[PDB]
Coordinates of C-alpha atoms and ligand atoms in Angstrom, one line a residue:
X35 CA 77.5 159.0 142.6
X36 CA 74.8 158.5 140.0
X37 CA 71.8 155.8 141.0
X38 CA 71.5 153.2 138.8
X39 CA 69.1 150.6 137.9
X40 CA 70.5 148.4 135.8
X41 CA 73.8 146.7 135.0
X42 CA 74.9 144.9 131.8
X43 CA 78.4 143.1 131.0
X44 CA 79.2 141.7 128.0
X50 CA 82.6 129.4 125.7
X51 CA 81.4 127.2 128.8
X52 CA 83.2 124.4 127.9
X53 CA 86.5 125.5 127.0
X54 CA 86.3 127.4 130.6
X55 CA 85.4 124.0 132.1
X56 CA 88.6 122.4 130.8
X57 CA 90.8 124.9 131.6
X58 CA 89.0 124.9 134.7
X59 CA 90.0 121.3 134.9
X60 CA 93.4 121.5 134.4
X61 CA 93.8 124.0 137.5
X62 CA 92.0 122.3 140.1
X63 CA 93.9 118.4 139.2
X64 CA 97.4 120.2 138.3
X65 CA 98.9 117.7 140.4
X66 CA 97.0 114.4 139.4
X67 CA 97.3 112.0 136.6
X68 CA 96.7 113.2 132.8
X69 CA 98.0 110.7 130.9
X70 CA 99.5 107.2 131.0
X71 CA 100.9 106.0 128.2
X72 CA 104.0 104.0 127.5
X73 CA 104.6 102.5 131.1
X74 CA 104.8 106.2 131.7
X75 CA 102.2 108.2 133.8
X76 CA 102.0 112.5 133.0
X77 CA 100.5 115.1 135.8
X78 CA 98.3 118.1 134.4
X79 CA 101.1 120.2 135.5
X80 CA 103.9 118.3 133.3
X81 CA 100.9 118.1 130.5
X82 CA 100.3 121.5 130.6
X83 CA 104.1 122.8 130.5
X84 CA 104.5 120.3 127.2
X85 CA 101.7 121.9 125.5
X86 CA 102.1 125.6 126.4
X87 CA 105.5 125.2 125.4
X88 CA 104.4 123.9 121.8
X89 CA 101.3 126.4 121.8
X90 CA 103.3 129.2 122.2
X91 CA 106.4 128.2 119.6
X92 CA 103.6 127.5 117.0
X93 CA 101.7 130.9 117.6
X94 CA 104.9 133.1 117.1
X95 CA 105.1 131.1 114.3
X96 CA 102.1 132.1 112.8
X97 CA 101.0 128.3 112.4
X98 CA 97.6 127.5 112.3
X99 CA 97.6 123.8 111.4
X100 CA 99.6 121.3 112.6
X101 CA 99.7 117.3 111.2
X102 CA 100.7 114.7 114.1
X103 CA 102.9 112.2 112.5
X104 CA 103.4 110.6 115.5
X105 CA 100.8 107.7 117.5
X106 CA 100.0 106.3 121.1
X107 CA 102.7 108.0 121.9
X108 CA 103.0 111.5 124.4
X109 CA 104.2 113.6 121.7
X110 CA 100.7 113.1 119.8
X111 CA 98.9 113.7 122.9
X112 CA 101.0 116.6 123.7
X113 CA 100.9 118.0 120.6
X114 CA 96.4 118.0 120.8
X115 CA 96.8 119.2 123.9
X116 CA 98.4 122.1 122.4
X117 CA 96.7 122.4 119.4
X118 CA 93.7 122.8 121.5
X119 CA 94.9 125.0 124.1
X120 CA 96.1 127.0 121.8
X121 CA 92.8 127.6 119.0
X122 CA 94.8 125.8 116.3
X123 CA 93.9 122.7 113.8
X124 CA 95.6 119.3 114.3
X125 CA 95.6 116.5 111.6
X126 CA 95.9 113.2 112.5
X127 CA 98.0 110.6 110.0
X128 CA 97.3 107.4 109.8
X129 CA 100.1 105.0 111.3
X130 CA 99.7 103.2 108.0
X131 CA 99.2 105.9 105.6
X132 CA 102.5 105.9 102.3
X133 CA 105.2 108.7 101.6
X134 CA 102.6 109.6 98.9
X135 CA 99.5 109.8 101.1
X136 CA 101.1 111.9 103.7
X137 CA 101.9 114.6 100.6
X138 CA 98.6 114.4 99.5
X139 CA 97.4 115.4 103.1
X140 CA 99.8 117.8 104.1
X141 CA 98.6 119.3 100.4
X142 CA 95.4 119.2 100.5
X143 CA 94.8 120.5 104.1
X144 CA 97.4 123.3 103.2
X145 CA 99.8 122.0 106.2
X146 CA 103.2 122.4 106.6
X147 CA 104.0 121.4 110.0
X148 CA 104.4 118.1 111.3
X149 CA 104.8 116.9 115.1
X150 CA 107.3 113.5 115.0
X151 CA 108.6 111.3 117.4
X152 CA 111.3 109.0 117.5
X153 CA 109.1 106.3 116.6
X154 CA 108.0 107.7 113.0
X155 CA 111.9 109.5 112.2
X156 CA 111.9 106.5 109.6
X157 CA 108.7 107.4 108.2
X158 CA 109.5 111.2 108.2
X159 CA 112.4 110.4 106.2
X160 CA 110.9 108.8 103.4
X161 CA 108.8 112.0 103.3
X162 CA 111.7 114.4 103.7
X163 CA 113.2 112.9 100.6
X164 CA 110.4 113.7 98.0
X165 CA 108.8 116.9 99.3
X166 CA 109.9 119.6 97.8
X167 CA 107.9 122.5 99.5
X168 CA 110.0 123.4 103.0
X169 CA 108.0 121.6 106.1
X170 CA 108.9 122.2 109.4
X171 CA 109.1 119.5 112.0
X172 CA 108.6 119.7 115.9
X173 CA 109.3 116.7 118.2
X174 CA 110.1 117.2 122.5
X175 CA 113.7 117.7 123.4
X176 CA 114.0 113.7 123.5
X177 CA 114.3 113.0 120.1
X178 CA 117.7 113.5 118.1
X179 CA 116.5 115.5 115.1
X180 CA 120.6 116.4 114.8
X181 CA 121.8 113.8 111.6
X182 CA 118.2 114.9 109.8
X183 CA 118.7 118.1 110.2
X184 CA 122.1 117.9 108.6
X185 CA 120.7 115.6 106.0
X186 CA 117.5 117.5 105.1
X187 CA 118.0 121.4 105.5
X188 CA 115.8 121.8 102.6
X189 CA 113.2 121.4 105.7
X190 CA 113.0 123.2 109.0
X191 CA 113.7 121.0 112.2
X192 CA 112.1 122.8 115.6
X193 CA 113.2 121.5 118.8
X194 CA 110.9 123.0 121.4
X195 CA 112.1 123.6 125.0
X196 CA 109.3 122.5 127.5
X197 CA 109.0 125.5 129.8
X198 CA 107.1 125.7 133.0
X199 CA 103.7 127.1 132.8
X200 CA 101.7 128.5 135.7
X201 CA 97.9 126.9 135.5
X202 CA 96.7 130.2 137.2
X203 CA 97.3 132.2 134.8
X204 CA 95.8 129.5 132.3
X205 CA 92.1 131.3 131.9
X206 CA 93.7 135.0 130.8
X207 CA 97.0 133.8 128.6
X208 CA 94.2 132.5 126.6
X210 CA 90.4 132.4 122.2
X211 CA 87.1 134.1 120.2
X212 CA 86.5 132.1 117.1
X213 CA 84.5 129.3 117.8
X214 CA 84.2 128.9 113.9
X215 CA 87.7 128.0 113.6
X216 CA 88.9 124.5 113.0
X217 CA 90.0 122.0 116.2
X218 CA 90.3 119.0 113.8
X219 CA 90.3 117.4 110.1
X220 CA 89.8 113.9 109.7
X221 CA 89.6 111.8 106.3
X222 CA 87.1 108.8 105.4
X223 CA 87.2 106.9 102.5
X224 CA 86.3 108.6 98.6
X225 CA 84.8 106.6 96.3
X226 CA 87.2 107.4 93.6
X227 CA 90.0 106.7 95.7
X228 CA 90.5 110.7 96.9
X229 CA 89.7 111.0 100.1
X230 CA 86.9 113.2 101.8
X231 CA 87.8 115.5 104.5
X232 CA 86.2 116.7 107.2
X233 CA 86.6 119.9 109.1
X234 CA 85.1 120.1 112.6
X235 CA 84.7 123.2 114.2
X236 CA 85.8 123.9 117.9
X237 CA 82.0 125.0 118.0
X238 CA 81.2 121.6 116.8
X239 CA 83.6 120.3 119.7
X240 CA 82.3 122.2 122.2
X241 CA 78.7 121.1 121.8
X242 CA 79.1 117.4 121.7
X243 CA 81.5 117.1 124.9
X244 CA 79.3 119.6 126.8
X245 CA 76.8 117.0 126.1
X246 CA 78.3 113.8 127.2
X247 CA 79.9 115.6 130.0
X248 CA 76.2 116.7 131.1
X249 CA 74.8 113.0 130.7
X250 CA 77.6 111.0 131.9
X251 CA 79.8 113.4 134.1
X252 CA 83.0 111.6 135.6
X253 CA 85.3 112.5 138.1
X254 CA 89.0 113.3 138.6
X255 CA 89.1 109.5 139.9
X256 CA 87.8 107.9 136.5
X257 CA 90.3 106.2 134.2
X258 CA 89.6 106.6 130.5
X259 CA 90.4 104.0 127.9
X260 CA 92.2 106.1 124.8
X261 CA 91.3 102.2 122.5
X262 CA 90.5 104.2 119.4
X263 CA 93.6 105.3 116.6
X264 CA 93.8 109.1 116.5
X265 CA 92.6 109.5 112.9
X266 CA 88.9 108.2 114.1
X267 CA 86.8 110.5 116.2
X268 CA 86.3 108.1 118.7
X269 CA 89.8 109.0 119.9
X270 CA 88.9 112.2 120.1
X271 CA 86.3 111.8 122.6
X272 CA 88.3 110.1 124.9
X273 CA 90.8 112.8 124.6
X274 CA 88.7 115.5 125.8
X275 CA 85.8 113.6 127.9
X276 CA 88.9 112.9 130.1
X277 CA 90.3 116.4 130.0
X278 CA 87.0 118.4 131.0
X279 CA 87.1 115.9 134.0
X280 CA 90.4 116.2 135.3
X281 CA 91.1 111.9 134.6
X282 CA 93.3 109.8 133.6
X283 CA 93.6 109.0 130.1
X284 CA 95.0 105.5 129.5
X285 CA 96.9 104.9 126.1
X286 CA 96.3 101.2 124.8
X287 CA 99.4 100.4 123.2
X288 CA 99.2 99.1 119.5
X289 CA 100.0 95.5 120.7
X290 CA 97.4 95.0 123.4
X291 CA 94.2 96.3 121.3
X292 CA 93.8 92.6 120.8
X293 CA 93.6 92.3 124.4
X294 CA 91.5 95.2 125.3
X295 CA 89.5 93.3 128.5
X296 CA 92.8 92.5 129.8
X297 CA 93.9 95.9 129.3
X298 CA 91.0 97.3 131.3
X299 CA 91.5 94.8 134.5
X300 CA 94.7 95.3 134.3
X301 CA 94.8 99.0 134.5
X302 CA 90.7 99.3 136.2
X303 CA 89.6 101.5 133.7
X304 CA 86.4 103.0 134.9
X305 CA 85.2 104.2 131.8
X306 CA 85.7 103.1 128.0
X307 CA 85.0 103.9 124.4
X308 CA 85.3 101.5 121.2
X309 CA 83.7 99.8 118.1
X310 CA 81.7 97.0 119.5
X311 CA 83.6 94.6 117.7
X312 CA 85.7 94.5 120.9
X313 CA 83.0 92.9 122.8
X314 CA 83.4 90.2 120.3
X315 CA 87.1 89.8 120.3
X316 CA 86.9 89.7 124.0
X317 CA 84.6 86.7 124.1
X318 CA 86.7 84.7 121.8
X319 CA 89.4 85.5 124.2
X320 CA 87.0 83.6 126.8
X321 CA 87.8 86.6 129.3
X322 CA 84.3 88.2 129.4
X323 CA 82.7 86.4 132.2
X324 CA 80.7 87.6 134.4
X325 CA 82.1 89.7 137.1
X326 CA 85.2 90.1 135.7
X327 CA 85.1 93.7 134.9
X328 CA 84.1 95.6 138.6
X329 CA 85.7 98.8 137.9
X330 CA 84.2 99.8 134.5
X331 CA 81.4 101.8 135.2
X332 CA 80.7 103.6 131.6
X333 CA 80.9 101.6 129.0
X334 CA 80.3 103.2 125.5
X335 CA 80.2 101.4 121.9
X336 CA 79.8 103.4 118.7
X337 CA 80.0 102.5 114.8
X338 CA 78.3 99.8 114.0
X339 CA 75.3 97.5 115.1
X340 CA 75.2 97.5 118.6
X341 CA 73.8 93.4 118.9
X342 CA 71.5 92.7 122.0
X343 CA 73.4 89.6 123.5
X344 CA 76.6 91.7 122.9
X345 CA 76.1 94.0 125.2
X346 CA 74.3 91.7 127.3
X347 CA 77.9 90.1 127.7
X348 CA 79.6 92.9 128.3
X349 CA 77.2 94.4 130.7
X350 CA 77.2 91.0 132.6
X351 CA 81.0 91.2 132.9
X352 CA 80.6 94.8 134.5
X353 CA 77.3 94.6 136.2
X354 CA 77.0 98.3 134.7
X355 CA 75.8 100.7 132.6
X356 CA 76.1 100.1 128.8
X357 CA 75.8 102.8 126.4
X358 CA 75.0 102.7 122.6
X359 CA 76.2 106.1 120.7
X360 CA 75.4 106.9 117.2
X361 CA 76.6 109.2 114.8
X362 CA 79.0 110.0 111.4
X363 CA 81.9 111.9 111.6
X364 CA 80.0 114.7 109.8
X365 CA 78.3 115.3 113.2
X366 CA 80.9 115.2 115.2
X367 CA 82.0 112.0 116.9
X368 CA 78.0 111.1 118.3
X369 CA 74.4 112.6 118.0
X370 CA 72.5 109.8 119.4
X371 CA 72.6 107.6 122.5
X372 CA 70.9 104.6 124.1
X373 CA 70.9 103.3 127.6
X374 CA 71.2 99.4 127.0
X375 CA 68.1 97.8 129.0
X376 CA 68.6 94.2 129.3
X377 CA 64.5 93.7 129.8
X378 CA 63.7 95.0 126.2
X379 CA 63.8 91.5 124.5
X380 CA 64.9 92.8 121.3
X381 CA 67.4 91.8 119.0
X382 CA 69.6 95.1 118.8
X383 CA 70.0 98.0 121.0
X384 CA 68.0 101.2 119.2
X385 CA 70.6 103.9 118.5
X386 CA 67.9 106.0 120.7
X387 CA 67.8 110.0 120.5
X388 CA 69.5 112.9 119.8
X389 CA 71.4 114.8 123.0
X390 CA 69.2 117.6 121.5
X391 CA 66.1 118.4 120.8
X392 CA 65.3 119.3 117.1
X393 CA 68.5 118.0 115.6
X394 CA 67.1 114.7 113.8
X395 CA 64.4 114.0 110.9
X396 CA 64.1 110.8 109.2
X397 CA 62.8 111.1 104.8
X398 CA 60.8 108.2 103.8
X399 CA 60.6 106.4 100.2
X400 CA 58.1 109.4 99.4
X401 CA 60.5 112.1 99.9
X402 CA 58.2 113.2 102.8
X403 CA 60.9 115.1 105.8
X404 CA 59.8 114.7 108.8
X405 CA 60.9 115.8 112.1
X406 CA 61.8 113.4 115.0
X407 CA 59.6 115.0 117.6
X408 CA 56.5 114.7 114.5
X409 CA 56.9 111.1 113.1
X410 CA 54.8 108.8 114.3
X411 CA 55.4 105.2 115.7
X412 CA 57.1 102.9 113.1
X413 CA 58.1 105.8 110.5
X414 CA 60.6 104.8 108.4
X415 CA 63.7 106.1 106.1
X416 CA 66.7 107.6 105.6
X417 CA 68.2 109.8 109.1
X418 CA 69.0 113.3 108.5
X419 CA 71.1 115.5 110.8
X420 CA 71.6 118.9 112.0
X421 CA 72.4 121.0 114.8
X422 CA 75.7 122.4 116.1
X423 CA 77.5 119.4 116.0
X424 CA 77.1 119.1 112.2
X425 CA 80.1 120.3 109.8
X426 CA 79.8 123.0 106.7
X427 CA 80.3 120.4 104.6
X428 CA 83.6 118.7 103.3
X429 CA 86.9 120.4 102.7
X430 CA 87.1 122.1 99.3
X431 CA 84.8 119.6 97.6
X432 CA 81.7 121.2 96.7
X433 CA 80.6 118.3 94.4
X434 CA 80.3 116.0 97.5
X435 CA 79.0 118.6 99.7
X436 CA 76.1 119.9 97.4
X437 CA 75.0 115.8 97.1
X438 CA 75.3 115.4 100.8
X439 CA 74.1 118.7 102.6
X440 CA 71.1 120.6 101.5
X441 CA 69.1 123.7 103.1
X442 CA 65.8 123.2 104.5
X443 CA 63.5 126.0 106.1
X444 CA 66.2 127.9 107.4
X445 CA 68.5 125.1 108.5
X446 CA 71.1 122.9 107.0
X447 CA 70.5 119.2 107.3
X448 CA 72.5 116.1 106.6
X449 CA 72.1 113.0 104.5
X450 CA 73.7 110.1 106.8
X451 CA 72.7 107.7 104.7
X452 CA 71.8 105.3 107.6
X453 CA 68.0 103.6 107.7
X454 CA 66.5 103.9 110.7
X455 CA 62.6 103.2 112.1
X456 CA 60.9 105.2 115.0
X457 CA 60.1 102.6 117.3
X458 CA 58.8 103.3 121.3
X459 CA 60.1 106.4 120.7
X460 CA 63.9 105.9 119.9
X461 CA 65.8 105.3 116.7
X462 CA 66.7 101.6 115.4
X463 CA 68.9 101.4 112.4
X464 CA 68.4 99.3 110.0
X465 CA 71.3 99.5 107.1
X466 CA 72.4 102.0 104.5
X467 CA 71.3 102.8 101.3
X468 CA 74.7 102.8 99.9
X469 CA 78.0 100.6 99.9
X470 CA 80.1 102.3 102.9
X471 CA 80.8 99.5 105.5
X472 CA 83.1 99.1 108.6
X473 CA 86.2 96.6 108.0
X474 CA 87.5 95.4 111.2
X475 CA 85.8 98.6 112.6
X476 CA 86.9 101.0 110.1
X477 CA 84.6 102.6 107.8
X478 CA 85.0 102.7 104.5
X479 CA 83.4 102.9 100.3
X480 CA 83.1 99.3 98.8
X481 CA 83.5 101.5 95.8
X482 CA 87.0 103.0 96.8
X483 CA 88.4 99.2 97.0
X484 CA 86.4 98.2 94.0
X485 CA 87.6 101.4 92.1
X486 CA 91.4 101.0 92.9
X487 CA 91.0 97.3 92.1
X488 CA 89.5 98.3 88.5
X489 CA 93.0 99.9 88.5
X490 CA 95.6 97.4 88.9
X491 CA 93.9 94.5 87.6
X492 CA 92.0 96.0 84.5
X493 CA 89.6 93.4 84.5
X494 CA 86.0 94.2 83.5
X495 CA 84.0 93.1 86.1
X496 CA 84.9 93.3 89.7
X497 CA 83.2 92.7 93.0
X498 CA 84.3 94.0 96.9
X499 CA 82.7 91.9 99.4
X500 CA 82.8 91.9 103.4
X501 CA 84.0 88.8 104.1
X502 CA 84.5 87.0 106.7
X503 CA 81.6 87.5 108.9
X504 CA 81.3 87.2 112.8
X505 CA 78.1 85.8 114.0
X506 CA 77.4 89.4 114.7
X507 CA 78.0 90.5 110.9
X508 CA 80.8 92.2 111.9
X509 CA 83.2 91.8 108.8
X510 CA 86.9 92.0 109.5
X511 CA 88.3 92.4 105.9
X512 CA 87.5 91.7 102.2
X513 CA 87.7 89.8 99.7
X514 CA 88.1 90.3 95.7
X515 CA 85.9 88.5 92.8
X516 CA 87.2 89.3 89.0
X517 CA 86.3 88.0 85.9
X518 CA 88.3 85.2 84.1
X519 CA 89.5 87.4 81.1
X520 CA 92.0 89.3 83.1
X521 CA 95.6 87.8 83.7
X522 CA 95.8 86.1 86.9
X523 CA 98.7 88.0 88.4
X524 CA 97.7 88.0 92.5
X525 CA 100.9 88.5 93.3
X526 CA 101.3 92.0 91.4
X527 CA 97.9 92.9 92.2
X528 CA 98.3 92.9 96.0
X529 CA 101.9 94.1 95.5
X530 CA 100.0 97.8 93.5
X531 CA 96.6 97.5 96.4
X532 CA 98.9 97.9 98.9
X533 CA 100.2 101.2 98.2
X534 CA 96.8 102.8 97.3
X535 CA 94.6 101.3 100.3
X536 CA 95.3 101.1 104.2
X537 CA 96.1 97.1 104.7
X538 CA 92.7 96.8 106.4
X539 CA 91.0 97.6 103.4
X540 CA 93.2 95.1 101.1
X541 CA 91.6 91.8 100.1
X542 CA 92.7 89.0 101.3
X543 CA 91.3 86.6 99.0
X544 CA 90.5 87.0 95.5
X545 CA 89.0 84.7 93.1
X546 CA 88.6 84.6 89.5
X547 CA 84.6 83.8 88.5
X548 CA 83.2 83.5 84.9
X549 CA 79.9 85.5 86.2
X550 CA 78.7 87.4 89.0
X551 CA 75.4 86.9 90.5
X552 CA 72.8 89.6 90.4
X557 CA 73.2 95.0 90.8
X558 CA 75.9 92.6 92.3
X559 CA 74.2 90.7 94.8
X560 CA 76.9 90.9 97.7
X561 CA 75.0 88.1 99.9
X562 CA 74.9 85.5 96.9
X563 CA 79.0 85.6 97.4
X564 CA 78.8 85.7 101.0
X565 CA 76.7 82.7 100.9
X566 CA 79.0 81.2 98.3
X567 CA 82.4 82.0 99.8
X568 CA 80.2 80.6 103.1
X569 CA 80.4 77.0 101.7
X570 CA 83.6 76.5 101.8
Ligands
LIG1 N1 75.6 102.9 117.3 C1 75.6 102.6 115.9 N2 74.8 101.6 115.4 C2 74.8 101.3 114.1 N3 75.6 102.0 113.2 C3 76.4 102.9 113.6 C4 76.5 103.3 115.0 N4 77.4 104.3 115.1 C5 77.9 104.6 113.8 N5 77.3 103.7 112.9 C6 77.6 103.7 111.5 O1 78.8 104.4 111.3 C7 78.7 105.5 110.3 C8 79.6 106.6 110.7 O2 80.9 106.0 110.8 P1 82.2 107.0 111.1 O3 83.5 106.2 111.0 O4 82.0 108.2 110.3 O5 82.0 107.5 112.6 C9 81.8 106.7 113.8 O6 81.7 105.5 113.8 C10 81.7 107.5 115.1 N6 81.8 108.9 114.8 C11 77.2 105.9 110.5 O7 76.7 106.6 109.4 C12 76.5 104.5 110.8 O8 76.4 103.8 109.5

């Protein structure tokens, strides 16, 4: 035998999950329904999917199906498996669904029996040949008799063996795990493709910061067409938990729903906090077993999560980021001795990622600007996306290359202040309505639309006493026909019902730019 001196041999994350899934194959995944899920019956309902969509050659799949185990089968799957999934939104029309499934180049849909009314409606008008999966629960039979211009799948769940999980598996880390959609200002919406690269960086982060245990129960609060969801998703997967689905009627109830089931750890908008409080259920002590509490979206308010905090007696975190960078970039330990009015949105997880562009057009990078800089945030790093899906327009005016990287225009003020982030507003129109984000313009634009009038105003309205505005409301001139009833009849089918205003008024002028507050203060007095 030769001497020798040295030895060389040829994704981190992905191994830790499947990692996971080994070593808890007999604990908890999922509960969901009044139904609880092992890894082991997890894992044999998304192998069995994995593998009937790979010899299928399918590459994206849209779930159709919410807070239900199919949809969380079906990620499961998609992930296991290097695929793309598409959430739908439980509210989205016939004609909404087409326009996804078109633009995202999608024909496969995972259903439940839940949504078989829904899918029928879409069965009806699509002409192009989709093919449907659902678990070997649902009765696909009469629509498969009625539709066989489309392709019904029922997939047998097999039993897997989690040993062999780490071989019978993935090399492009470029690839697609998810698209999501937000809000277009001209009514077509943006999409967003996020990498399993992307993925992989931010929950290697938050698993590194705030590791949990195979003991921790996750809240799953979040719908599965925002990001948040899919943080909970995977945070609990890496960690071997238990991932607790809140079902659609008890998100108004979401500090019962944590005593009730001790969830240890839990994600949502921080209007929750609020909603809780007005419940009177947030009192102190009330909460023992959450021990991680994150909020992310909007304005994280100081006596908020003073509140909350006081109900747990723990830690309280504040996470920032747009779904362009992948779910969070920025965090914030809440310190209840900082005697300011909002929790800073703090710093990146990495190094390098963040610079801030003042009124000059001066860049400058986080770890540069000094004390009290101020201006728009920019974003980078490996938990930024390309860009949008096949819109170029909106990607050139959003993403730009810099000395070698490519940053991103959040559009979110911020000021360097003791060394973390605090935002301040946008220097644009896109606002959270009850939590979800979306263009004043896109409202204002389909509203144009169905009433014709000439001048037309979108504002937030009403307002909590944290600003938090739970829906809108509609100003438009006194030319127009006052038809209301037709007009929310035609807004109805062209916005989510979040979005819709729910009062609309008919004023000879508007005050002045619109000056949203002027109507705030107006609509304020009575
Ligand atoms: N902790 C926080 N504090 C203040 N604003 C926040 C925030 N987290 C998110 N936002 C706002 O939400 C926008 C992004 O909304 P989004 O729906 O794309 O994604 C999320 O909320 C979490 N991915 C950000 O550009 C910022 O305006």
């Amino acid at each position: 035998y030769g001497v020798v001196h040295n030895q060389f041999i040829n994704c981190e994350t992905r191994h830790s999950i499947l990692a996971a899934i080994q070593a808890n194959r007999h604990a908890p995944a999922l509960w969901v329904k009044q139904k609880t899920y092992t890894y082991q019956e997890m894992t044999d309902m998304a192998l069995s999917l994995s593998d009937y969509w790979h010899l299928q050659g399918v590459q994206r799949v849209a779930i159709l199906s919410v807070r239900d185990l199919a949809a969380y089968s079906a990620i499961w799957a998609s992930y296991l498996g290097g695929m793309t999934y598409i959430p739908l939104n439980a509210r989205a029309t016939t004609e909404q669904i087409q326009e996804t499934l078109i633009a995202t180049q999608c024909d496969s849909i995972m259903v439940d029996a839940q949504q078989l009314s829904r899918l029928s409606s879409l069965l009806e008008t699509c002409i192009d040949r989709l093919h449907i999966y659902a678990l070997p629960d649902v009765d696909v039979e009469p629509l498969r008799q009625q539709y066989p211009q489309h392709t019904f799948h029922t997939v047998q769940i097999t039993e897997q063996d989690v040993e062999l999980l780490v071989v019978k598996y993935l090399d492009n880390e470029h690839e697609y795990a998810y698209i999501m959609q937000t809000s277009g200002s001209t009514g077509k919406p943006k999409r967003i493709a996020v990498s399993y690269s992307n993925l992989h960086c931010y929950i290697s982060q938050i698993d590194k910061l705030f590791p949990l245990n195979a003991q921790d129960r996750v809240g799953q609060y979040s719908d599965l067409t925002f990001d948040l969801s899919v943080h909970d998703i995977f945070y609990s997967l890496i960690s071997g938990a238990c991932l607790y689905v809140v079902p659609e009627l008890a998100k108004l109830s979401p500090a019962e729903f944590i005593h009730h089931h001790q969830l240890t750890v839990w994600l949502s908008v921080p209007t929750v906090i609020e909603l809780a409080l007005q419940r009177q259920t947030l009192t102190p002590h009330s909460l023992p077993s959450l021990r991680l509490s994150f909020f992310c979206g909007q304005a994280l308010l100081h006596d908020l999560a003073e509140q909350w905090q006081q109900a747990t007696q723990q830690p309280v975190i504040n996470l920032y980021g747009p779904t362009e960078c992948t779910i969070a970039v920025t965090y914030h330990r809440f310190v209840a001795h900082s005697g300011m009015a909002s929790v800073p949105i703090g710093r990146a997880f990495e190094e390098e990622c963040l610079a801030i562009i003042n009124e000059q057009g001066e860049l400058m990078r986080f770890e540069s600007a000094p004390e009290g800089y101020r201006g728009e945030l920019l974003l980078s790093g490996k938990q930024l996306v390309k860009g949008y899906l096949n819109d170029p327009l909106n990607t050139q005016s959003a993403f730009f290359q810099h000395e070698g990287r490519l940053w991103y225009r959040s559009g979110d003020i911020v000021t360097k202040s003791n060394g973390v982030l605090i935002h301040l507003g946008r220097r644009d129109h896109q606002v959270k309505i009850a939590g979800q984000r979306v263009e004043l313009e896109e409202i204002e634009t389909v509203v144009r639309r169905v009433t014709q009038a000439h001048s037309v105003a979108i504002v937030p309205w009403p307002l909590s006493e944290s600003g938090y505005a739970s829906g809108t409301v509609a100003f438009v001139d006194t030319h127009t026909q006052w038809q209301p009833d037709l007009w929310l009849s035609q807004c109805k089918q062209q916005l989510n019902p979040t979005f819709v205003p729910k009062r609309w008024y008919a004023i000879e002028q508007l005050p002045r730019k619109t000056d949203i507050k002027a109507l705030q203060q107006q609509l304020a007095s009575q």
